[PDB]
Write a protein that binds this ligand. Structure first.
Ligand SMILES: C=C[C@@H]1C[C@]1(NC(=O)[C@@H]1C[C@@H]2CN1C(=O)[C@H](C(C)(C)C)NC(=O)O[C@@H]1C[C@H]1CCCCCc1nc3ccc(OC)cc3nc1O2)C(=O)NS(=O)(=O)C1CC1
Ligand SMILES: [Zn+2]
Length: 191
């Protein structure tokens, strides 16, 4: 298997949630084999890719987190070569690396607000209501197909801080009315 490769980012930039592709497929190939990636990186939310899967990853207090069902145990390519996972937990569906060169990191949420916001791979910011340890309800139902490819992306509080990592969708006949995520407290405990 190859290294995970950053192929873009989801910009909250200044005002607009928009997606920025920074690498093509072809280049994704050679880079996964070497794990050496000089391509420029920015921001908190990365679009990450394997040979078969595209999903997201989020930097929180110096660690780049994503889902195990996306990354597995792979390294992630960097300018100084392939980066080995700092944290792994198959049961939680969680993996972490040292935040990449060029990135910014999110702050853990400390305000306890139930008003959350899920960022998707499509660069949509979707309102969510905290409804338990690892669960939050959507204000608007959406088909799964819409959310697919967004695991590893962040759930944010109204202050912009990180509340969790998107893990799975709670679906009924293919309609998602809630989301399952890894809470930051769970990250802090994994560390
Ligand atoms: C947008 C949709 C959603 C965020 C996404 N997550 C999934 O699709 C997960 C993967 C797998 C099935 N998923 C689901 O969401 C299902 C599904 C019916 C398919 C919607 N929903 C579901 O279980 O409801 C259950 C009540 C909750 C409680 C149980 C959830 C279990 C969570 C889970 N843990 C592990 C630990 C270790 C593993 O080793 C290989 C593998 C795992 N796989 C898991 O779920 C996503 O976008 N992925 S992705 O980006 O396209 C892909 C590129 C990476
Ligand atoms: Zn907060």
């Amino acid at each position: 298997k190859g290294s995970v490769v950053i192929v873009g980012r989801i910009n909250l930039s200044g005002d607009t949630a928009y997606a920025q592709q920074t690498r093509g497929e072809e280049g994704c190939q050679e880079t996964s084999q070497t794990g050496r990636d000089k391509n420029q990186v920015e921001g908190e939310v990365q679009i990450v890719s394997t040979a078969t899967q595209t999903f997201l990853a989020t930097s929180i207090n110096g660690v780049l987190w994503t889902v195990h069902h996306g990354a597995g145990t792979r390294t992630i390519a960097s300018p100084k070569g392939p980066v080995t996972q700092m944290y792994t937990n198959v049961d939680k569906d969680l993996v972490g690396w040292q935040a990449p060169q060029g990135s910014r990191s999110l702050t853990p949420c400390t305000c306890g607000s139930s008003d959350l916001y899920l960022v998707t791979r499509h660069a949509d910011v979707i309102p969510v209501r905290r409804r338990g340890d690892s669960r939050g309800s959507l204000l608007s139902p959406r088909p799964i197909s819409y959310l697919k490819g967004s695991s590893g992306g962040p759930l944010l509080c109204p202050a912009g801080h990180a509340v969790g990592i998107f893990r799975a969708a709670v679906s009924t006949r293919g309609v998602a009315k809630a989301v399952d995520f890894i809470p930051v407290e769970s990250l802090e405990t994994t560390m």
